Symmetry: C2
């Protein structure tokens, strides 16, 4: 209840900063489109302004990623899912770097290029959670991490339950119940406040999800195109896996040669923008948007792509429809335009996420899934223009739900989870296609689990971070024999004045192994050095309460590394006093286990 007050204040400021950032980003994009409309149609001058805006904005964000933030480039979720695996980086969790990312992320979201949103927003959300936890309870750790992840994605998209499911279902092994209680509570409140303020100030008539894709919802599917639903898993996940492979094909491409390393050391700044320059050469709407339709910021691009009609029979008319008018070449078949759409988008999304930016890998992946979905919907509308008969009512198909199941399925394959489709129908506003997208997402996840590793697993692999992985292969010859450290810290309780001042003047660390005697070698517990210092100074001052805890563990010295990994996984505890008969024999660390599981 009262911790829930902490939670709702958290989600309050989360909704504030989310509304602020997308408000300013939308104003920026509409101001750009305002000017680019209003000046004149001059093909040197439209090209001029078309190349002036993006890289000024992008390299402004890149300056903020470079100079103020020392290490926060390429940030997102995999570093904090490694933090909940144990490796703490408090210098990386800096509040000052916090502001260094988000407004740059605003300039990231100010980009006309597709960018990532949620991963950095998850990270800065966990920053907000940790800092406000520092401010509160004076006026539990991976709990705050998991809560931060849940409220971050659920305040990105106003999606509570898919947000908490997307937090817990991948970034854990076990999970505590007070944490999901806090999770859905703050996530529901965050999704609540995020939607109302756009009705408070700048009308968003009362509630959509974000996107109301209106359908007839009467005889929707049917099950005759259900074998076509076979396709809506399989190849989708296939190409998603290829994406992962190609991402590694450029991550090694980050550091395959020394010459680009040397010129990067010569000047770090110029590298992303120039190649964005050439896809700026592949964005230009009257030059090459004649054959790509580059007039599409991705949000309204997919809302227009979610049009509840058949564009093959709307290839029958030259009618001024809504924004879907941008989907017509006057003499080229529109299956060819969806061809050039998906091909240019997949080989531009890779270099979009390649550049040194804190990037999530979800939103261009959404637009390619939606592209494939309305692709297959329009081409089977071409193959079957007939529809069915029903009681005095002909029911033909429509590809909007096909677009939304593609933009659930392929990104679920990419994300190696199922919560992505939960976000997908939760933003869709209608829940006709639930069990087909569920079947497709589990098909694509088992394809992707069969073939390739994850995105973020490959990310922590290439970045070579300290992580725990494992793969359930307990071989014959692995023993804890060269791993424990036979350095022994020790305190006897029998230490008097000189010995106590010696302990004051010698050691450094926060808590200590406490034994009976150093000849006994048998551990008793662990004691705060700080409490000892406090007791000694506050007994030495008034011149002129021994509480004891225990060590909950012992490593029997012939345990396999897989079962020891399992042990530290279920404990969630860091170090090991590997003893024999009570008598301490070695010290085992988490990083030592990681270096062992290298083998």
């Amino acid at each position: 209840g009262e911790d829930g007050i902490f939670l709702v204040l958290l989600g309050l400021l989360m909704a504030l900063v989310s509304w602020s950032m997308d408000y300013v980003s939308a104003k920026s994009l509409q101001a750009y489109k305002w000017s680019y409309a209003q000046m004149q149609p001059s093909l040197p001058l439209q090209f001029l302004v078309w190349v002036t805006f993006p890289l000024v904005l992008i390299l402004f964000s890149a300056l903020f990623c470079h100079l103020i933030s020392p290490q926060a480039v390429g940030s997102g979720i995999p570093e904090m899912k490694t933090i909940l695996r144990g490796v703490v980086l408090k210098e990386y969790l800096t509040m000052k770097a916090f502001v260094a990312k988000v407004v740059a992320l605003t300039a990231g979201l100010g980009s006309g290029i597709p960018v990532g949103k949620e991963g950095p927003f998850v990270h800065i959300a966990s920053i907000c959670a940790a800092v406000l936890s520092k401010f509160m309870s004076v006026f539990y750790y991976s709990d705050i991490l998991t809560v931060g992840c849940a409220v971050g994605v659920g305040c990105c998209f106003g999606t509570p339950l898919g947000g908490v499911l997307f937090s817990i279902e991948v970034t854990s092994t076990y999970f505590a119940v007070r944490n999901y209680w806090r999770g859905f509570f703050a996530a529901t409140f965050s999704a609540f406040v995020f939607r109302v303020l756009a009705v408070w100030n700048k009308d968003a008539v009362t509630i959509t999800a974000l996107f109301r894709t209106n359908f007839r919802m009467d005889f929707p599917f049917d099950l005759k195109e259900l074998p076509a639903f076979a396709a809506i898993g399989i190849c989708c996940g296939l190409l998603g896996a290829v994406f992962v492979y190609l991402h590694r094909q450029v991550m090694l491409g980050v550091r395959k040669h020394k010459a680009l390393s040397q010129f990067l050391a010569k000047h770090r700044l110029l590298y992303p923008g120039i190649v964005t320059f050439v896809i700026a050469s592949f964005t230009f709407p009257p030059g090459m948007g004649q054959f790509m339709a580059g007039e599409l910021m991705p949000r309204e691009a997919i809302s227009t792509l979610f049009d509840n009609n058949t564009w093959v029979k709307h290839a029958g008319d030259p009618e001024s429809l809504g924004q879907s008018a941008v989907w017509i070449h006057p003499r080229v078949n529109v299956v060819i335009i969806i061809f050039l759409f998906f091909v240019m988008k997949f080989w531009m999304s890779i270099v979009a996420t390649t550049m040194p930016i804190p990037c999530g890998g979800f939103m261009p992946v959404f637009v390619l899934g939606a592209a494939f979905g309305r692709l297959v919907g329009e081409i089977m509308a071409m193959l079957f223009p007939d529809g069915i008969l029903f009681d005095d009512i002909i029911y033909k198909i429509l590809p909007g739900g096909y677009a939304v199941i593609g933009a659930a399925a392929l990104t679920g394959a990419v994300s190696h989870t199922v919560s992505t489709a939960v976000i997908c129908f939760e933003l869709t506003g209608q829940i006709a296609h639930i069990l087909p997208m569920m079947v497709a997402v589990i098909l694509a996840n088992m394809v992707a689990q069969s073939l390739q590793p994850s995105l973020y697993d490959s990310i922590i692999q290439v970045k070579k971070l300290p992580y725990l992985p494992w793969n359930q292969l307990s071989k014959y010859t692995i023993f804890v024999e060269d791993i424990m450290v036979r350095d022994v810290k020790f305190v006897s309780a029998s230490y008097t004045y000189g010995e106590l001042r010696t302990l004051l003047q010698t050691t450094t660390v926060k808590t200590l192994p406490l034994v009976d005697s150093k000849d006994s070698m048998i551990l008793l517990g662990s004691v705060e050095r700080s409490e000892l210092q406090a007791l000694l100074q506050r007994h030495l001052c008034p011149e002129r309460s021994c509480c004891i805890d225990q060590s909950p563990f012992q490593l029997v010295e012939q345990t396999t590394l897989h079962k020891t990994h399992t042990l530290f996984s279920l404990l969630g505890l860091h170090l090991a006093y590997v003893t024999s008969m009570g008598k301490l024999r070695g010290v085992l660390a988490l990083e030592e286990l990681q270096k062992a599981i290298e083998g």
Copy 2:
């Protein structure tokens, strides 16, 4: 993948038995209504047939609950959520009692009284999972329990994600990720196959959820009635808590006196039916259904209750609408009919779940939540008949979504969870009212968590079962001093022929504490007695491979009971070799911890 084949065969037979049971139940109810229509309107004779059908059917089910099943009366979820807390009852998990429940549950679902469905279906689902796991892997325990619970509720209602959420979120403390993978996989497949077969044989045009409650979904709520949404939590959860209290008011009412105990021992059979007899006297449609409208099996009763119109302005017409025509008295205001509706339903649902039947406590609770929802919707339609203005379109309110948020909210309060509302909108077919029902469910859950215990917690309390509870109150004076058992089983590895045959001829249990020597008292590990017997017989026969595992634990002998409860909770392990300096000093059991936490 291949364990997923086991999973989909499981969910296949689950969908088979679910389709079978509700198919036969629907045929039974329509055959009853067929006869009760077709004979004649005679008030002695309609009363005659009206009292003949139900208790014949009910006491048929009660005979199956009594005679064939020795202990399976009052079954459901709380016994198996206690089983995953450790207490195994394999005699209670009998396949033969399995068939003894379900067809009786069919006669339970054949009843015109509101009954429970999911709890017994969860239990028999876990029975199916355990038996098929016994049959497979020859051609992990609470994993099978949690999978059984998830697939049971998700095959009850065709609801995968709310089903797996309803399995995990209450019946656990920690939870493993392979288990939810299996969970949503089989749950999605079960929900898939359950819906298609009603289109295969007996048309259910292709896909609803179950109930397509069609709404205008255009300016739906608005936020001006949002303070009325304050009410839709609070009092709802209030009365739900009163329900729990009143349930205990009859559970003690089960065993408050000795005279009814003596007459129950005289003949167990007659007790439920007679009081059902008198509410049969409170069911009769021309006698007292003039003032209760008893012509309502609950499924179509709530689908009719989900009518997307205002019955106050439809109190304006005598028009033959659909089934909603049964909601009219020709001279009594319909707020008074909803008065008698909710009052008779809440004091009949208690004695419905009271009787010795395996019963869930959800479906009449759904109908009272829906009753309160359309109650408040119709009365604010009376208070505000105006609606709003919009662009040449007047938008007035409609109480169907109000009915569905009530039938999410109060049953979420009753169930002490949030997954119930997930099932609610997942069966609703439209997801307009998501964030209001989320806000209402968290309000009602915090009210119910503030006031009263759970249903099933009170159930295991009154049934006095062996369970672990706790309540985060570590007092000053609790120590593990009178709890460990100083009986020591011991085997030395140095035992030769006569000593080994002595160990063969003496002990009983499956695995044993293995020590170095009995004078050492220091435990080494645990060894299967069966493997020892096998080695000795298969070395004694060919006349005429010592593998060693370790004991992963030690209880330091001054641990508090709350932290020891926490220890066994996080381990998921049963017994404790409480040693000192290696040397074994006591044996601590789970039931001993339960008897300690009695204090």
